[PDB]
Amino acid sequence: VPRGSHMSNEAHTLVTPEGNVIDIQGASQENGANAIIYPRHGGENQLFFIDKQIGWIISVFSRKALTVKENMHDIVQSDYCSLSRQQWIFEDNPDGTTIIRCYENPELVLSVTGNIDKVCLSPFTREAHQLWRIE
Amino acid sequence: EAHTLVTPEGNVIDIQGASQENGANAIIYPRHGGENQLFFIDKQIGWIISVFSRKALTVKENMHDIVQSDYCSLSRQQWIFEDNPDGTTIIRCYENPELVLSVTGNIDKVCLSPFTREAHQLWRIE
Ligand SMILES: C[C@@H]1O[C@H](O)[C@H](O)[C@H](O)[C@H]1O
Ligand SMILES: C[C@@H]1O[C@H](O)[C@H](O)[C@H](O)[C@H]1O
Numbered sequence A: 001v002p003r004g005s006h007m008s009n010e011a012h013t014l015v016t017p018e019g020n021v022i023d024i025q026g027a028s029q030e031n032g033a034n035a036i037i038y039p040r041h042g043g044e045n046q047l048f049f050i051d052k053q054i055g056w057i058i059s060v061f062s063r064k065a066l067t068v069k070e071n072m073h074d075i076v077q078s079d080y081c082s083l084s085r086q087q088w089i090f091e092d093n094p095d096g097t098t099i100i101r102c103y104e105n106p107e108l109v110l111s112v113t114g115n116i117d118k119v120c121l122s123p124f125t126r127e128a129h130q131l132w133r134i135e
Numbered sequence B: 001e002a003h004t005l006v007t008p009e010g011n012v013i014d015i016q017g018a019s020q021e022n023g024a025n026a027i028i029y030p031r032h033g034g035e036n037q038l039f040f041i042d043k044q045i046g047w048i049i050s051v052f053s054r055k056a057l058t059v060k061e062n063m064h065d066i067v068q069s070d071y072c073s074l075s076r077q078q079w080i081f082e083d084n085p086d087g088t089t090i091i092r093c094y095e096n097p098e099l100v101l102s103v104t105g106n107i108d109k110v111c112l113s114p115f116t117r118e119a120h121q122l123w124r125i126e
Helices: none
Strands: A021-024 A035-038 A048-051 A056-059 A065-068 A075-078 A088-092 A098-102 A108-112 A119-123 B012-015 B026-029 B039-042 B047-050 B056-059 B066-069 B079-083 B089-093 B099-103 B110-114
Touching: A035 A075, A035 A119, A075 A119, B026 B066, B026 B110, B066 B110
Parallel strands: none
Antiparallel strands: A021 A035, A048 A056, A056 A065, A065 A075, A088 A098, A098 A108, A108 A119, B012 B026, B039 B047, B047 B056, B056 B066, B079 B089, B089 B099, B099 B110
């Protein structure tokens, strides 16, 4: 309906340069489940809502937020709690890629531990997997 | 997926002054559909989030006053939606579900009160 509201309804994928996607491991609905890289398969555990009014990234399947652990390296899903470790700056590049920076320390950006391995937070060095495609 | 929370008279929960601040009151107001009258409700989590402010409907520690505040996964920001067959809903505070979204008067403030099946305790989520 019944209303006009300013908020994205689109489910997104977060895509690597090889075409793989951020995926919540095991299609888990639990706190602490790892974010990993996986080939795209249509499943809801690879889809995320992104709200650029506040900067959250929420799993469509679990409704939990992409979160950097307190260690400032590991990326999991966890209940949204308005934490700086759950809020992201989307730096949009002219080529259509995006640097996804941690609000708590924006020098630390969404990265991978390997091409088809885990998602992590790492210092920005313009490494290829720090340049995401939000589809 | 934005909703209004509607009273029997057709008025709605409204964040006072269209405020974006922590602690702003939830009040009853004639329906205009501005974003301070619209709320995201997610029944996987149990939150009620203002579209305009992106802050959660929150019971204060006094267990009576209703405000908005940053969502911090508090039991005082989580809600049970008890759905009746005629399309009304009792919105109960997770921290103490005997206490439910209510009003201090027909077009006055939103509060938490013991459930007595008062007409303003039976919301229509539209
Ligand atoms: C069950 C399977 O688990 C994998 O770890 C990955 O999360 C996949 O997307 C999921 O379908
Ligand atoms: C400015 C005005 O303030 C009122 O208290 C109410 O919140 C209305 O919705 C808003 O439009």
